[PDB]
Design a protein around this ligand. Structure first.
Ligand SMILES: CN1CC[C@@](O)(C#Cc2ccc3c(c2)-c2nc(C(N)=O)c(C(=O)NC4CCOCC4)n2CCO3)C1=O
Length: 322
């Protein structure tokens, strides 16, 4: 009964507070209200409005799929961080309910979320290295040791999420952010996230088509293993410099994911045996036979050891795709 009253006290105002208050308030998002989780972003007289209390970077350059992520600055404190705009009308409660209260170096920290009119503005740490997607484009494709190194870090994040029965729902290079030197990778974008205990029912927004697991596309029941398939599709993208399936099939790719064998022919022949063995185990069509996050993180960790550890520089020379 008191949660009713706690929620009412948050509605109508932007406040400094904790993750659990943000989650409580976020649930009412299917007027300027919100909760800011860091001292660096401060409301002013119950408010936190764009171009008043915080401003985006000089010419408005945008990143992510929809150009919806921006560099910003709190006008009072001068602290810079990142903001992701989500339209309120299609806002998914889970995006905040999942990541709020998490604390792992493999997941990008949440700094707050403020509703203003038709927007939900979600604030987070600005990681200056850019996404792993941008790295692949710039370098053409990644060397094996660097590819393993990041896959392992992504899988560390997934262990952490899977232990709390949270599915990421859209694991890929565009959703892994790198620190300024390239040595730390963290999962971002919980817009497709999901709490656990099939996916094709009403509320569900599907992830990236190329990285979809077979049980997702056939409408079969789905668990945390979904993410593992995606992580290995991301592995192939890092190595080959292109998504799986795109090179061999032009038409609707979700029909070929269902019928065809898993894309293990796309594993480079020059990869070391345990790299190829690891990718095969994460790309088993039946989730019961497919490696878990913990299982796969351990193999990938030894696969990296088997090729002499992380040696190649962050931004080496361009390597041509397939
Ligand atoms: C914990 N939270 C809270 C909100 C969250 O669901 C998100 C997100 C999201 C989605 C797409 C993105 C991103 C986030 C994203 N975030 C950043 C960032 N935080 O810095 C960037 C990025 O690459 N920014 C900088 C790159 C260097 O130039 C300055 C901008 N991107 C570009 C990649 O597209 C989530 O996961």
């Amino acid at each position: 009964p008191v949660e009713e009253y706690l929620v009412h006290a948050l509605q109508g105002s932007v406040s400094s507070g904790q993750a659990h208050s943000l989650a409580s308030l976020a649930k009412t998002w299917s007027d300027n209200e919100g909760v800011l989780l860091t001292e660096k972003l401060k409301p002013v007289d119950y408010e936190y409005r764009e171009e008043v209390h915080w401003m985006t970077h000089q010419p408005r350059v945008g990143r992510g799929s929809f150009g919806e992520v921006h560099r910003m600055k709190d006008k009072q404190t001068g602290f810079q961080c990142a903001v992701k705009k989500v339209r309120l009308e299609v806002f998914r409660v889970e995006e905040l309910v999942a990541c709020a209260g998490l604390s792992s170096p493999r997941i990008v920290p949440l700094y707050g979320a403020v509703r203003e009119g038709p927007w939900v503005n979600i604030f987070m740490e600005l990681l200056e290295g850019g996404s792993l997607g941008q790295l692949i484009k710039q370098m053409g494709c990644l060397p094996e040791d660097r590819a393993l190194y990041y896959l392992g870090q992504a899988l560390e994040g997934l262990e952490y999420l899977h232990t709390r029965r949270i599915l990421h729902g859209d694991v890929k290079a565009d959703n892994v952010l790198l620190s300024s030197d390239g040595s730390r990778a963290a999962l971002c974008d919980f817009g497709h996230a999901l709490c656990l205990q099939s996916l094709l029912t009403g509320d569900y927004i599907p992830g990236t088509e190329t990285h979809m697991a077979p049980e997702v596309v056939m409408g079969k029941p789905c668990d945390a293993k979904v993410d593992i398939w995606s992580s290995c599709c991301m592995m192939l993208h890092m190595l080959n410099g292109c998504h799986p399936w795109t090179q061999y099939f032009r038409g609707p790719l979700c029909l070929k994911i269902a019928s065809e064998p898993p894309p293990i022919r796309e594993i480079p022949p020059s990869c070391a045996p345990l790299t190829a063995q690891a990718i095969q185990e994460g790309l088993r069509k039946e989730p019961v036979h497919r490696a878990s996050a913990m299982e796969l993180r351990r193999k990938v960790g030894k696969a990296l050891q088997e090729v002499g550890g992380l040696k190649s520089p962050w931004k080496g020379e361009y390597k041509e795709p397939r």
